Design an enzyme around this catalytic site. Structure first.
Site, short mmCIF file in Angstrom:
data_model
loop_
_atom_site.label_atom_id
_atom_site.label_comp_id
_atom_site.label_asym_id
_atom_site.label_seq_id
_atom_site.Cartn_x
_atom_site.Cartn_y
_atom_site.Cartn_z
N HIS A 91 0.93 -1.29 -0.18
CA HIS A 91 0.12 0.07 -0.12
C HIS A 91 0.97 1.41 0.21
N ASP A 122 7.56 19.91 -28.49
CA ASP A 122 7.56 18.63 -27.85
C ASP A 122 8.38 18.50 -26.83
N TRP A 130 7.32 0.03 4.10
CA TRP A 130 7.66 0.63 2.95
C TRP A 130 9.07 1.31 3.17
N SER A 164 13.53 5.12 -14.18
CA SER A 164 12.37 6.01 -15.07
C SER A 164 12.51 7.33 -14.47
N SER A 165 12.53 7.53 -12.94
CA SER A 165 12.50 8.95 -12.45
C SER A 165 13.78 9.56 -12.74
N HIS A 200 13.10 12.05 2.87
CA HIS A 200 12.22 13.19 3.00
C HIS A 200 12.19 14.00 1.81
N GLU A 242 11.67 13.06 -1.19
CA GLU A 242 10.61 12.39 -1.73
C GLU A 242 9.48 12.83 -1.48
N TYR A 285 8.95 15.92 -0.38
CA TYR A 285 8.87 17.34 -1.12
C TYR A 285 8.61 17.10 -2.54
N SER A 329 -1.29 26.77 -7.90
CA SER A 329 -0.86 28.41 -8.51
C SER A 329 -1.42 28.45 -9.66
N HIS A 387 14.73 13.93 11.15
CA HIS A 387 13.59 14.04 12.01
C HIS A 387 12.80 12.80 12.06
N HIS A 388 13.17 11.88 11.10
CA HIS A 388 12.73 10.51 11.15
C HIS A 388 13.47 9.54 11.88
N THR A 408 7.12 27.84 3.27
CA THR A 408 5.98 27.11 3.15
C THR A 408 4.66 27.91 3.48
N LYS A 419 4.12 30.68 0.84
CA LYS A 419 3.09 30.31 -0.44
C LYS A 419 1.73 30.45 -0.10
N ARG A 468 1.58 2.17 14.80
CA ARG A 468 1.38 1.73 13.44
C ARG A 468 1.76 0.34 13.28
C1 HEA Z 1 3.71 14.99 0.75
C2 HEA Z 1 3.95 14.58 1.66
C3 HEA Z 1 4.48 15.27 2.86
C4 HEA Z 1 4.69 16.67 3.20
C5 HEA Z 1 4.52 18.08 2.36
C6 HEA Z 1 5.32 16.53 4.48
C7 HEA Z 1 5.64 17.92 5.03
C8 HEA Z 1 6.26 17.84 6.31
N1 HEA Z 1 6.45 16.93 7.22
FE1 HEA Z 1 6.02 14.90 6.81
N2 HEA Z 1 5.95 13.06 6.48
C9 HEA Z 1 5.18 12.45 5.20
C10 HEA Z 1 4.74 13.29 4.10
C11 HEA Z 1 4.99 14.57 4.22
N3 HEA Z 1 5.47 15.39 5.08
C12 HEA Z 1 5.15 11.03 5.62
C13 HEA Z 1 4.75 10.21 4.36
C14 HEA Z 1 5.87 10.68 6.73
C15 HEA Z 1 6.07 9.36 7.27
C16 HEA Z 1 6.77 8.44 6.57
C17 HEA Z 1 7.17 7.23 7.39
O1 HEA Z 1 7.37 7.17 8.47
O2 HEA Z 1 6.92 5.87 6.86
C18 HEA Z 1 6.14 11.91 7.36
C19 HEA Z 1 6.58 12.06 8.79
C20 HEA Z 1 6.89 13.42 9.08
C21 HEA Z 1 7.33 13.24 10.47
C22 HEA Z 1 7.78 12.03 11.43
C23 HEA Z 1 8.72 11.21 10.77
C24 HEA Z 1 9.02 10.02 11.94
O3 HEA Z 1 9.83 10.29 12.90
O4 HEA Z 1 8.38 8.95 11.70
C25 HEA Z 1 7.63 14.74 10.76
C26 HEA Z 1 8.04 15.25 12.00
O5 HEA Z 1 8.46 16.30 12.06
C27 HEA Z 1 7.27 15.47 9.49
C28 HEA Z 1 7.37 16.68 9.29
C29 HEA Z 1 6.82 17.41 8.34
C30 HEA Z 1 6.97 18.87 8.09
C31 HEA Z 1 7.24 19.70 9.26
C32 HEA Z 1 6.29 19.14 6.84
C33 HEA Z 1 6.50 20.50 6.39
O6 HEA Z 1 6.62 20.66 4.91
C34 HEA Z 1 4.88 21.21 6.56
C35 HEA Z 1 5.01 22.66 6.60
C36 HEA Z 1 3.58 23.20 6.24
C37 HEA Z 1 2.86 24.08 7.29
C38 HEA Z 1 3.48 24.11 8.80
C39 HEA Z 1 1.49 24.44 7.17
C40 HEA Z 1 1.53 25.54 6.18
C41 HEA Z 1 1.89 26.86 6.86
C42 HEA Z 1 1.45 27.75 7.66
C43 HEA Z 1 -0.09 27.54 7.79
C44 HEA Z 1 2.08 28.98 8.26
C45 HEA Z 1 3.42 28.76 9.17
C46 HEA Z 1 3.09 27.50 10.14
C47 HEA Z 1 3.95 27.49 11.08
C48 HEA Z 1 4.99 28.51 11.17
C49 HEA Z 1 3.75 26.36 12.23
N4 HEA Z 1 6.72 14.47 8.82
C1 HEA Z 2 -0.28 8.19 -1.93
C2 HEA Z 2 -0.09 7.55 -1.10
C3 HEA Z 2 -1.16 7.04 -0.31
C4 HEA Z 2 -2.66 7.02 -0.35
C5 HEA Z 2 -3.73 7.53 -1.39
C6 HEA Z 2 -3.34 6.27 0.94
C7 HEA Z 2 -4.55 6.29 1.04
C8 HEA Z 2 -5.22 5.52 1.92
N1 HEA Z 2 -4.54 4.96 3.04
FE1 HEA Z 2 -2.53 4.87 3.16
N2 HEA Z 2 -0.45 4.84 3.64
C9 HEA Z 2 0.34 5.31 2.83
C10 HEA Z 2 0.27 5.79 1.71
C11 HEA Z 2 -1.17 6.28 1.26
N3 HEA Z 2 -2.38 5.79 1.61
C12 HEA Z 2 1.62 4.97 3.30
C13 HEA Z 2 2.88 5.67 2.51
C14 HEA Z 2 1.58 4.19 4.44
C15 HEA Z 2 2.36 3.85 5.41
C16 HEA Z 2 2.94 2.40 4.87
C17 HEA Z 2 3.59 1.62 6.03
O1 HEA Z 2 2.87 1.32 7.08
O2 HEA Z 2 4.43 1.20 5.84
C18 HEA Z 2 0.09 4.23 4.57
C19 HEA Z 2 -0.65 3.51 5.67
C20 HEA Z 2 -2.14 3.29 5.67
C21 HEA Z 2 -2.41 2.55 6.84
C22 HEA Z 2 -1.70 1.96 8.11
C23 HEA Z 2 -1.46 0.47 7.77
C24 HEA Z 2 -0.64 -0.25 9.21
O3 HEA Z 2 0.11 0.63 9.55
O4 HEA Z 2 -1.25 -1.12 9.67
C25 HEA Z 2 -3.83 2.94 6.69
C26 HEA Z 2 -5.05 1.99 7.68
O5 HEA Z 2 -5.92 2.41 7.34
C27 HEA Z 2 -4.17 3.31 5.71
C28 HEA Z 2 -5.19 3.77 4.92
C29 HEA Z 2 -5.52 4.30 3.79
C30 HEA Z 2 -6.84 4.58 3.20
C31 HEA Z 2 -8.12 4.12 3.88
C32 HEA Z 2 -6.63 5.47 2.01
C33 HEA Z 2 -7.62 5.99 1.35
O6 HEA Z 2 -8.76 5.12 0.77
C34 HEA Z 2 -8.20 7.28 1.25
C35 HEA Z 2 -9.16 7.65 0.55
C36 HEA Z 2 -8.93 7.50 -1.03
C37 HEA Z 2 -9.65 7.00 -1.79
C38 HEA Z 2 -10.98 6.63 -1.55
C39 HEA Z 2 -9.10 6.59 -3.08
C40 HEA Z 2 -9.16 7.90 -3.82
C41 HEA Z 2 -8.29 7.66 -4.98
C42 HEA Z 2 -7.10 7.89 -5.39
C43 HEA Z 2 -5.99 7.80 -4.29
C44 HEA Z 2 -6.28 7.51 -6.64
C45 HEA Z 2 -6.54 8.59 -7.62
C46 HEA Z 2 -5.43 8.30 -8.74
C47 HEA Z 2 -5.26 9.30 -9.62
C48 HEA Z 2 -5.99 10.75 -9.53
C49 HEA Z 2 -4.57 9.12 -10.98
N4 HEA Z 2 -2.89 3.80 4.84
O1 LIG Z 3 8.74 13.26 5.54
O2 LIG Z 3 8.10 14.56 6.01
CU LIG Z 4 10.58 14.00 6.48
#
Ligand code: HEA
Ligand code: HEA
Ligand SMILES: [O-][O-]
Ligand SMILES: [Cu+2]
Ligand SMILES: CCCCCCCCCCCCCCCCCC(=O)OC[C@H](COP(=O)([O-])OCC(O)COP(=O)([O-])OC[C@@H](COC(=O)CCCCCCCCCCCCCCCCC)OC(=O)CCCCCCCCCCCCCCCCC)OC(=O)CCCCCCCCCCCCCCCCC
Ligand SMILES: CCCCCCCCCCCCCCCCCC(=O)OC[C@H](COP(=O)([O-])OCC(O)COP(=O)([O-])OC[C@@H](COC(=O)CCCCCCCCCCCCCCCCC)OC(=O)CCCCCCCCCCCCCCCCC)OC(=O)CCCCCCCCCCCCCCCCC
Ligand SMILES: CCCCCCCCCCCCCCCCCC(=O)OC[C@H](COP(=O)([O-])OCC(O)COP(=O)([O-])OC[C@@H](COC(=O)CCCCCCCCCCCCCCCCC)OC(=O)CCCCCCCCCCCCCCCCC)OC(=O)CCCCCCCCCCCCCCCCC
Ligand SMILES: CCCCCCCCCCCCCCCCCC(=O)OC[C@H](COP(=O)([O-])OCC(O)COP(=O)([O-])OC[C@@H](COC(=O)CCCCCCCCCCCCCCCCC)OC(=O)CCCCCCCCCCCCCCCCC)OC(=O)CCCCCCCCCCCCCCCCC
Ligand SMILES: CCCCCCCC/C=C\CCCCCCCC(=O)OC[C@H](COP(=O)(O)OCCN)OC(=O)CCCCCCC/C=C/CCCCCCCC
Ligand SMILES: CCCCCCCC/C=C\CCCCCCCC(=O)O[C@H](COC(=O)CCCCCCC/C=C/CCCCCCCC)COP(=O)(O)OCCN
Ligand SMILES: [K+]
Ligand SMILES: [Zn+2]
Lengths: 62, 76, 61, 107, 65, 226, 141, 103, 93, 459
Positions: free
Chosen positions: J60, J90, J125, J152-153, J228, J230, J232, J243, J277-278, J303, J306, J428
């Protein structure tokens, strides 16, 4: 560059139109069905048509 | 220098030395030659090839004295 | 030398500048599509068998 | 920052006392899904689609000039749906400057 | 040619054969089965049942069914 | 132009092996009926025949001299067409910057087809605004909705054809008196005698007029191994 | 220079933004009409006014950039340019000389001393009873 | 250069194609299977794909099954050892020359 | 002849000294049946016959030799093993 | 032809089509999870088959990130409009563009085939060793997919970078987002490949990097150094789409264009140096933790700029224009949702708070709000904006207020409870749980089944 791929070419005329033996024009598949039901509402929405224009987009129940 | 490299003391198997989870077979996934020997452990392979030869299975190498072959860089 | 007699440069894709040779090379690989499918399908069978996944029902019978 | 074009007071003086801003409608009209004719084959439906392009439309002002469909980005300038080959002639991005050379003029 | 002006002209001009859409949906359906079928197969392999009964791995009342 | 690659060897001159072997018909073909290779050798044979005759040059008018070398006399119509061709070619790989467009002097947008995409960026300095893209189609005086800049499409079209260097030449250049093969022979003997060939195009051209492989050494010149 | 740059080291096409300094300004000049005096009002715009080949200097720049590509002889650069063209080659060659005639002698000397005294000449002798050569780069100890 | 008419009159008088008929949400549940089992070009392609995929699967299948059985019997040198032991028993000799060599 | 930028220092054309008959291509003209190439003599296309022939021979030798080694020679880890991998002569196993 | 096509616009469609197809498997895997977590005790997975659940969560996560969202946002929309936003015709490298989509498909087939044929086990994952290197061959197969996906990426990143050479117009904000994402891939992918090779070495070449005297934490540093960037890389293309949509649908010039561009650049620079921070709970040095915590908070500054610039784009727009279009609603919804996800990210950036919230469903909800709602909705919004240009039909999504409202309500039902569960606490990657967490898990499960039903209404 002489002989290179032209920057513009005019479309050739379309192929001849086809008529059935009785003279009726031949129809071709068209995926724009006329759904059958009793609803006849028509919703209109002012839509962006660029920066300086709009268009009154209509959705018809049929 | 490599042709006459001096022998070195046999390594004492320390706390974290010579750890194996599975046999060495990445070179020969299907044949699995010298599963116990490491990929470039020549002396281990020589004795392993000898077993295979004693089992009527030919294997190439480790049979000619170094001083009786050309390009050995080990002649006096 | 006449510039207008080289239009095959843009009328034909470069992959087929060679005429029949380029087409024949493309056609030869096309013949291998189904042999590849059988070969690939065999690998799936090999892994499926080696993992005893065929004995799912016989295991509990 | 951009705040519109600069205007001088003299430029706002009308030549008649009855002048008011022209009331020309910039709504291009009423539209919906492009509706093809069953009789039209593939080639003629393509012509139909090419004749329904909003980006080929404009509004004609009272002096004969037209304000066309305009967009911030060139994504809205290709035919909809996008054809295989879009920009056969390179789109021109017009910049303006105050530089000039004598060869362009004649006395 | 006019027919070649638009990419995927048959679909865009609404003349395409519906089978193309069916294959796309079928392909998606098959992709989904890769999560369900191995679940059933693995459950049976290690338990002898395709799916568990809810809370069957815990102590149940006499009248539970 | 900056977007062109290096000059080829052919961009300077063509090899003599490309000379048409039927020179007699080549020098009698009208200009509109001559291809690129045929036109090149017609001008080179006729142009070099007049230039390699010093005693006649001072008495030859510039109009006649230009005709012999194949150079087109410039006039307002031809100059206009050529100028717009070069502007179109330059804009292929160059920026589009110029004076602000007005009704009296609309921005000129050259095009071959009936349409070309254009962007308006307003005036200079503060008057510059974000890019506003529009499709400039023929027959409309376009007015930017933001800055009121006027654009107009100019089409390089003429009688079911688009303007090209060859098209301009054919339309305006007029064929003069038919080239006389006696001049070719007379100049040939002037610069080619007793195994010395200082006028080689004429030597080949004269040989073709006499058939092929008649003059000394021409049989050996035309014999190839592959 | 090795790397190709559109602006300066453009050897693929040979384009140059400005003409050679040899030509008199009357013959050819850099394309700069920033100093053009204000146009009289009675003058009328005949040409497009668009930056391009209608300007004489730009036309001559385009013409020269195509016709300069054939020249009777080489335009010999000065020794400064020639040095810069092979700066890396010459320096790598001198680096090879340094390895042979500087590094080699003292590396050989150290090994010979190490043979007799058990440690390189640039190392403190040990008193701890461990055998072997020991470190080589003393200042990284 | 080709000359074509403005229109052509077809020999038949059948209006085979036209606007698609109104359909429901589950219209695909019966129309799709109908096409597979009733359209010539559909099941001909399916049969062609199935036949040739299976056709080339057999020779690979036969080769692997023999290989798999051979591998389970032992390593290459284990197979030769059994023949060597069988040869010793046949001759009654404790030591015999290797294959391809004489006494 | 080659490029137009290479020329003799003295432009001289030899006065034919032999009486050899002109080759046909030396006097040939463009004809409707030969719009191109009339100036070059016709030559045999050996590549069309030699390439497939040589390829087949090499494949046959390659495969035949591989099959012979795996059949005539005793079992071994590799081809070199089957040739030289046997025990020393006189070493009974 | 269909496979031989090099047209970038066609390839862009293929990326979108393939992501939807793979999305179904990802949705199925997601649905399996929430059904199991409906209540304590096994529901659809046997206790003797718990290994399958670990594979479900592992796939997943992998499929959704690398095979669904990344191709959709970085491969699909960019390949369609990026050469159009540029004045060029193109893509620069047409043949490379063709092979990139084919590579993605082949890697997908390898992954799903491994489910069917190999024994089903999971390691998350993130593939943390030593668990990843003591597993069965399914782990080997998944590694091949990732490495193949990496090819590919990177080649696609090379393709987009070449637009700078040929672009004949202005570099719009959207173009900047794709370019900077390509830069992140170029710098982060080779590090990922190196560490993945070490995982293969231990799995397949008897390497000893991840046994005693070999620091297992070494993997976490190298992995998250790519991990991380990734996240971003996933979101930055989404920012570009928002935008364009906001400016186009409101007839307002993008405010602070240069500030937007610099914010994207700043995020990438900061995003490349905050990966640890992970790794708060592993026991890093005091000064190291303070550094990463301090720099992680700084990412909010660009952030935030924006976010505010987006808000002023919507403010003051003409009232006469209809605001119920699905593309506009999704773009506005993104701002509301992203703020929730980002704020919770800042909360878990504080390492002492993270001690309690690491490996809990609070982290799940954090990245689902950003990715499952925000990124998906941004991808949906972009596709809807380009409906006329793309030309797809046979769906009711352009003006469907029911779909937008139901989607927003139900996705919030799924993931808001997961924040609460995080403090309760529920770990989790867990199948069973204590009876006293059922209520919140039950509510989220009801949310999951509801969302799937809504998707059927679009057709
Ligand atoms: C698109 C995906 C995405 C994005 C954008 C982000 C964005 C951010 N993530 Fe996230 N992050 C994940 C995907 C993402 N993350 C995933 C997938 C994990 C779990 C991975 C795993 O463990 O499997 C994770 C995990 C994760 C962790 C925990 C890691 C761990 O211990 O397991 C933390 C801890 O700080 C973190 C922080 C942040 C922060 C600080 C941002 C910042 O970019 C957010 C900044 C945005 C705001 C703050 C809001 C907008 C700003 C304002 C409204 C005004 C200013 C606000 C303040 C000054 C507070 N992320
Ligand atoms: C893009 C990434 C992505 C997306 C869409 C989702 C979507 C969802 N995920 Fe998540 N999820 C992850 C990434 C994502 N997840 C990751 C990275 C983890 C951590 C893995 C790990 O534990 O190691 C995780 C873990 C995770 C867990 C924890 C598993 C565990 O620890 O035991 C659960 C539990 O309910 C969950 C639930 C869901 C549900 C209910 C939805 C969705 O059903 C929410 C609603 C969405 C829909 C109803 C579908 C909408 C359509 C699309 C998303 C496709 C659209 C396609 C195009 C537009 C081309 N997710
Ligand atoms: O990874 O936030
Ligand atoms: Cu991170
Ligand atoms: C996330 C979800 C939600 C998303 C919501 C948001 C969506 C927003 C909108 C997004 C839009 C994006 C942009 C869209 C642009 C579209 C452009 C387009 O249409 O291009 C034209 C393009 C092609 O049109 P064309 O130009 O006419 O093409 C002509 C052909 O090239 C030539 O014609 P031809 O007839 O010659 O064709 C050849 C044909 C030949 O055809 C035939 O011969 C057909 C014969 C019939 C076969 C039917 C299948 C049979 C299956 C049997 C199963 C039996 C099971 C038994 C089980 C037993 C159990 C006990 O096929 C072949 O030969 C090859 C076929 C190969 C591909 C299909 C593979 C199928 C799956 C295979 C699985 C194998 C599994 C093995 C596993 C083993 C493991 C060990 O269209 C398509 O391809 C269809 C696209 C349809 C979707 C369009 C978009 C609509 C909007 C979205 C709708 C929602 C979708 C949701 C996902 C699906 C859910 C399931
Ligand atoms: C302690 C003792 C032991 C020491 C051991 C040392 C070990 C060193 C290992 C080096 C390995 C070899 C690498 C070079 C092989 C080629 C050598 C060669 O041919 O040299 C002669 C030759 C000399 O050229 P020339 O035109 O004849 O110059 C004539 C004169 O020299 C005068 O020339 P000019 O001055 O007039 O300029 C012309 C020339 C001048 O250029 C050169 O000649 C280059 C010479 C480089 C030699 C290597 C020196 C070490 C460089 C270290 C760089 C570190 C980067 C920062 C790392 C941060 C870590 C946290 O320009 C070019 O050739 C342009 C080349 C394209 C450059 C592309 C750069 C892309 C990356 C940009 C930075 C990205 C980060 C941005 C961060 C800020 C964001 C806001 O060099 C080249 O032509 C090579 C160019 C092609 C290869 C470029 C490779 C770029 C790699 C970029 C990596 C970016 C990674 C970013 C992320 C990192 C952190 C995650
Ligand atoms: C009463 C008590 C009294 C006590 C008295 C005590 C007395 C004590 C005396 C101490 C004296 C201290 C003196 C200090 C002041 C120094 C002043 C000075 O001159 O500084 C500048 C001076 C030179 O600098 P510079 O002026 O910039 O150079 C001028 C150049 O010509 C600039 O021109 P350029 O830039 O045109 O140069 C050419 C350049 C032009 O560039 C280009 O053409 C463009 C391209 C450039 C990029 C290239 C990219 C890659 C190229 C690929 C090709 C590679 C080929 C090689 C491949 C190898 C494969 C294995 O190309 C190259 O140079 C590079 C290419 C050549 C080959 C490169 C080979 C690899 C280099 C990297 C590795 C280095 C480590 C190797 C280690 C060994 C092997 C593993 O610096 C030094 O010499 C360093 C200072 C060292 C201080 C050491 C202090 C500690 C030692 C003390 C010893 C005495 C103690 C005794 C005991 C006393 C107890 C009391
Ligand atoms: C005095 C002068 C004297 C002169 C003397 C001259 C002598 C000349 C002798 C020439 C003959 C040499 C013969 C030996 C050649 C080597 C052959 C070999 O074994 O190679 C592999 C050999 C190892 O093999 P092996 O252990 O010996 O053989 C074990 C057996 O294969 C045991 O079998 P297995 O079952 O374990 O194997 C698994 C099976 C796996 O089999 C399967 O999976 C398939 C089974 C069922 C198939 C049934 C059909 C169903 C459909 C199948 C569809 C497949 C395709 C599907 C799509 C793709 C996916 C598969 O694999 C195969 O079948 C292997 C072959 C597969 C095909 C590969 C392509 C070969 C094409 C060759 C010809 C080109 C094309 C021709 C086209 C013709 C058109 C007209 O590896 C190497 O050679 C490694 C070293 C690298 C080369 C070193 C070269 C050294 C050169 C030394 C030169 C010395 C110069 C001295 C100069 C001195 C001057 C003084
Ligand atoms: C005509 C024939 C020509 C042949 C010669 C010319 C061509 C040569 C081509 C390049 C060869 C490069 C070989 C690289 C691998 C070297 C392997 C090696 O040396 O490994 C051993 C060395 C040190 O080991 P020790 O023996 O313990 O050292 C103790 C010293 N006494 O390192 C290792 O063990 C690491 C091994 C890493 C091997 C990586 C090579 C790739 C292998 C991939 C196998 C994948 C199989 C699975 C299926 C997928 C197939 C793609
Ligand atoms: C010719 C071109 C050459 C280019 C070479 C580029 C080399 C660098 C490439 C990127 C890799 C960076 C190296 C990896 C650094 C890891 C360090 C690490 O993990 O250390 C932390 C501690 O590290 C820190 O304190 C974190 C510092 C952050 C290092 C970041 C380095 C790489 C940054 C690249 C960002 C992108 C480029 C930005 C350029 C400028 C932008 C304006 C672990 O600490 P503890 O486990 O507690 O152990 C401490 C003692 N027991
Ligand atoms: K449960
Ligand atoms: Zn304007």
């Amino acid at each position: 560059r002489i002989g290179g791929p032209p920057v513009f070419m005019q479309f050739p005329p379309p192929p001849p139109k086809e008529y059935l033996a009785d003279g009726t024009p031949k129809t071709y598949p068209l995926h724009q069905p006329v759904f059958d039901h009793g609803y006849t509402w028509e919703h209109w929405y002012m839509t962006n048509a660029g920066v300086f224009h709009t268009v009154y987009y209509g959705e018809f129940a049929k | 220098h490599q042709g006459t490299k001096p022998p070195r003391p046999v390594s004492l198997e320390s706390r974290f030395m010579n750890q194996r989870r599975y046999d060495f077979t990445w070179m020969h996934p299907q044949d699995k030659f010298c599963s116990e020997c490491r990929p470039v452990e020549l002396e281990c392979k020589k004795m392993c090839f000898d077993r295979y030869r004693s089992m009527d299975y030919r294997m190439y190498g480790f049979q000619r004295p170094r001083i009786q072959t050309y390009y050995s860089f080990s002649t006096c | 030398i006449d510039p207008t007699k080289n239009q095959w440069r843009w009328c034909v894709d470069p992959a087929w500048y060679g005429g029949m040779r380029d087409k024949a090379n493309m056609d030869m690989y096309r013949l291998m599509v189904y042999p590849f499918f059988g070969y690939a399908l065999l690998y799936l069978h090999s892994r499926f068998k080696q993992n005893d996944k065929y004995n799912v029902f016989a295991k509990w019978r | 920052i951009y705040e519109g074009q600069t205007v001088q007071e003299s430029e706002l003086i009308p030549q008649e006392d009855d002048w008011v801003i022209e009331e020309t409608n910039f709504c291009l009209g009423r539209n919906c899904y492009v509706r093809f004719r069953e009789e039209d084959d593939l080639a003629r439906r393509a012509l139909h689609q090419m004749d329904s392009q909003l980006n080929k439309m404009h509004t004609r002002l009272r002096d004969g000039t037209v304000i066309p469909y305009m967009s911030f980005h060139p994504d809205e300038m290709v035919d909809r749906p996008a054809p295989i080959h879009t920009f056969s002639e390179k789109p021109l991005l017009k910049w303006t400057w105050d530089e000039t050379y004598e060869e362009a003029y004649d006395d | 040619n006019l027919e070649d002006h638009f990419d995927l002209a048959e679909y865009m001009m609404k003349m395409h054969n519906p089978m193309s859409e069916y294959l796309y949906w079928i392909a998606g359906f098959v992709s989904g089965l890769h999560g369900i079928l191995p679940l059933l197969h693995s459950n049976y392999y290690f338990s002898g049942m395709f799916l568990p009964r809810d809370n069957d791995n815990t102590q149940l009342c006499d009248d539970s069914w | 132009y900056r977007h062109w690659h290096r000059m080829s060897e052919d961009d300077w001159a063509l090899p003599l092996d490309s000379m048409p072997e039927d020179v007699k018909t080549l020098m009698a073909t009208p200009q509109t009926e001559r291809g690129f290779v045929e036109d090149y050798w017609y001008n080179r044979i006729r142009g070099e025949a007049t230039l390699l005759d010093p005693e006649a040059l001072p008495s030859k008018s510039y109009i006649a001299l230009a005709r012999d070398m194949g150079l087109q006399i410039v006039d307002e119509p031809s100059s206009h067409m050529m100028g717009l061709i070069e502007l179109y070619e330059y804009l292929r790989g160059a920026s589009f910057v110029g004076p602000f467009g007005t009704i009296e002097n609309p921005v000129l947008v050259p095009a071959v087809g009936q349409e070309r995409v254009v962007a308006c960026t307003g005036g200079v300095g503060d008057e510059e605004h974000f890019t506003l893209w529009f499709r400039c189609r023929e027959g409309f005086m376009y007015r930017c909705g933001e800055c009121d800049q006027i654009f107009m499409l100019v089409r390089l079209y003429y009688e079911d054809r688009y303007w090209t260097q060859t098209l301009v030449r054919d339309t305006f250049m007029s064929d003069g008196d038919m080239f006389d093969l006696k001049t070719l022979e007379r100049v040939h003997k002037m610069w080619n005698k007793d195994e010395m060939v200082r006028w080689e195009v004429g030597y080949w051209a004269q040989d073709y007029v006499l058939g092929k492989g008649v003059l000394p050494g021409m049989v050996e010149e035309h014999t190839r191994v592959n | 220079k090795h790397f190709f740059t559109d602006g300066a080291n453009d050897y693929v096409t040979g384009w140059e933004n400005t003409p050679p300094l040899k030509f008199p300004a009357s013959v050819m000049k850099p394309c700069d009409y920033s100093m053009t005096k204000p146009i009289p009002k009675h003058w009328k715009l005949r040409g497009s006014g668009i930056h391009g080949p209608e300007n004489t200097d730009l036309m001559k720049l385009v013409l020269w950039n195509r016709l300069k590509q054939k020249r009777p002889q080489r335009e010999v650069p000065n020794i400064n340019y020639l040095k810069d063209s092979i700066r890396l080659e010459l320096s790598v060659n001198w680096w090879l000389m340094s390895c042979i005639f500087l590094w080699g002698p003292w590396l050989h000397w150290g090994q010979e001393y190490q043979k007799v005294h058990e440690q390189p000449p640039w190392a403190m002798k040990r008193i701890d009873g461990l055998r072997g050569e020991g470190y080589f780069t003393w200042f990284l100890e | 250069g080709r000359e074509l008419p403005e229109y052509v009159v077809l020999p038949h008088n059948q209006q085979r194609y036209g606007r698609d008929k109104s359909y429901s949400y589950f219209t695909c549940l019966w129309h799709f299977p109908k096409m597979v089992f009733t359209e010539k070009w559909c099941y001909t392609n399916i049969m062609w794909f199935v036949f040739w995929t299976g056709f080339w699967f057999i020779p690979n299948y036969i080769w692997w099954e023999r290989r798999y059985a051979y591998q389970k019997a032992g390593f290459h040198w284990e197979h030769t050892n059994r023949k060597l032991q069988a040869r010793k028993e046949a001759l009654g000799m404790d030591k015999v020359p290797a294959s391809g060599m004489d006494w | 002849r080659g490029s137009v930028f290479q020329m003799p220092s003295t432009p001289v054309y030899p006065l034919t000294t032999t009486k050899k008959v002109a080759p046909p291509t030396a006097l040939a003209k463009r004809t409707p049946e030969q719009p191109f190439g009339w100036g070059s003599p016709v030559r045999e296309d050996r590549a069309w016959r030699v390439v497939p022939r040589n390829f087949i021979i090499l494949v046959i030798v390659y495969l035949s030799g591989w099959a012979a080694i795996k059949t005539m020679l005793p079992r071994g880890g590799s081809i070199l093993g089957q040739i030289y991998g046997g025990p020393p002569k006189g070493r009974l196993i | 032809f269909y496979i031989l096509v090099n047209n970038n616009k066609r390839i862009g469609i293929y990326y979108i089509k393939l992501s939807i197809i793979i999305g179904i498997l990802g949705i199925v895997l997601s649905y399996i999870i929430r059904v199991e977590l409906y209540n304590s005790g096994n529901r659809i997975i046997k206790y003797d088959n718990v290994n399958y659940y670990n594979m479900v969560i592992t796939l997943h996560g992998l499929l959704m990130i690398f095979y669904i969202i990344m191709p959709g946002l970085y491969g699909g929309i960019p390949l369609y409009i990026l050469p159009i936003l540029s004045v060029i015709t193109d893509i620069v490298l047409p043949r490379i563009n063709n092979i990139s989509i084919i590579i993605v498909l082949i890697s997908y087939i390898v992954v799903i085939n491994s489910i069917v044929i190999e024994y089903n086990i999971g390691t998350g994952w993130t593939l943390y060793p030593p668990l990843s290197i003591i597993g069965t061959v399914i782990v080997n197969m998944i590694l091949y997919g990732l490495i193949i996906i990496g090819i590919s990426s990177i080649i696609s990143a090379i393709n987009f970078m070449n637009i700078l050479i040929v672009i004949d117009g202005i570099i719009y904000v959207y173009i900047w987002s794709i370019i900077i994402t390509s830069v992140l891939l170029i710098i982060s992918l080779p590090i990922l490949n190196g560490i993945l090779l070490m995982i293969l070495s231990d799995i397949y070449f008897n390497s000893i990097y991840f046994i005693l005297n070999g620091d297992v934490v070494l993997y976490q540093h190298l992995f998250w150094y790519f991990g991380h960037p990734e996240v971003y890389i996933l979101i930055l293309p989404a920012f570009g789409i928002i935008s364009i949509i906001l400016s186009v649908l409101n007839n307002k010039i993008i405010f602070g264009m240069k500030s937007m561009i610099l914010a994207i650049i700043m995020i990438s620079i900061l995003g490349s140096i905050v990966w640890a921070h992970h790794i708060y709970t592993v026991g890093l040095e005091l000064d190291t933790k303070i550094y990463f915590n301090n720099l992680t908070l700084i990412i909010s500054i660009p952030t935030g700029n924006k976010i505010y610039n987006w808000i002023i784009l919507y403010i003051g727009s003409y009232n006469i224009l209809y605001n119920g279009y699905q593309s506009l609603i999704f773009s506005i919804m993104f701002i509301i949702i992203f703020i929730i996800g980002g704020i919770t990210g800042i909360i878990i950036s504080i390492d002492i708070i993270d001690i309690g919230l690491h490996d809990t469903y609070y982290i799940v909800s954090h990245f689902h709000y950003i990715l499952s709602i925000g990124a998906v909705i941004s991808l949906l919004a972009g596709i809807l904006l380009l409906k006329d240009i793309i030309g797809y039909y046979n769906v009711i999504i352009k003006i469907n207020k029911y779909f937008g409202l139901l989607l927003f309500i139900n996705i919030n039902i799924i993931f808001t409870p997961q924040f609460i569960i995080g403090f309760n606490v529920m770990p989790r990657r867990i199948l069973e749980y204590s009876d006293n967490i059922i209520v919140w898990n039950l509510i989220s499960s009801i949310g999951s089944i509801s969302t799937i039903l809504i998707l059927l209404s679009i057709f």
